[PDB]
């Protein structure tokens, strides 16, 4: 599809059998999702924010559907205020920026 | 141009005759720029991130040129490590996401 930017580019995603909303973010290297029960192996990771660090769970080789398109990649799961789909998955669905 | 997302979508912007690098960020409502000297009046503002808020200065009606497109809009100036072009300007240059 063509997504315009008059509104936030929020789309439906499916991951671990669950539907959620997530922001397509060309500025993000990485994909960060709200706390969530996900099966499988993960690695602990720390990220430094404004007031301090957050701990997240890194899941690699995860299958995620983004606005209908299947994609495989790394997702970080933790206390984020918004679900962010970053470039690591946007490339996998063939997403381009056009103007 | 058409921009793939395998690398950060960094472009050159022109603001007050100066050339700076900035990131085209579909996930950002607003445009946020590093400490610089813009002329005239501003309004104090707060932008939220992980674990807190950053103080910024909001300037209206600023001319920014991006890949030949001339946008006029609101910019937030603050201690951002990266210049962020948000949807307020991305919509003015005709930017869409496509996959």
């Amino acid at each position: 599809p063509q997504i315009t930017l008059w509104q936030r580019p929020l789309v439906t995603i499916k991951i671990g059998g669950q539907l959620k909303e997530a922001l397509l973010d060309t500025g993000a290297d990485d994909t960060v999702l709200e706390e969530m029960n996900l099966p499988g192996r993960w690695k602990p990771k720390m990220i430094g924010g404004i007031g301090g660090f957050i701990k997240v769970r890194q899941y690699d080789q995860i299958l995620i559907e983004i606005c209908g398109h299947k994609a495989i990649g790394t997702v970080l799961v933790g206390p984020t205020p918004v679900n962010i789909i970053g470039r690591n998955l946007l490339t996998q669905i063939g997403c381009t920026l056009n103007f | 141009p058409q921009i793939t997302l395998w690398q950060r979508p960094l472009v050159t912007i022109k603001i007050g005759g100066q050339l700076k690098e900035a990131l085209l960020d579909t996930g950002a409502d607003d445009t946020v720029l590093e400490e610089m000297n813009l002329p005239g009046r501003w309004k104090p503002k707060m932008i939220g991130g992980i674990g807190g808020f950053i103080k910024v200065r909001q300037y209206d009606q600023i001319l920014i040129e991006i890949c030949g497109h001339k946008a006029i809009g609101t910019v937030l100036v603050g201690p951002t490590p990266v210049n962020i072009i948000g949807r307020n300007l991305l919509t003015q240059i005709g930017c869409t996401l496509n996959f």
């Binding site: 973010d25 500025g27 993000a28 290297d29 | 960020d25 950002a28 992980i50 490590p81």
Partner: peptide, 8 residues
């Protein structure tokens, strides 16, 4: 690295 979350 997610600039809108101020994460780098």
């Amino acid at each position: 690295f997610v600039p809108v979350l101020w994460l780098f």
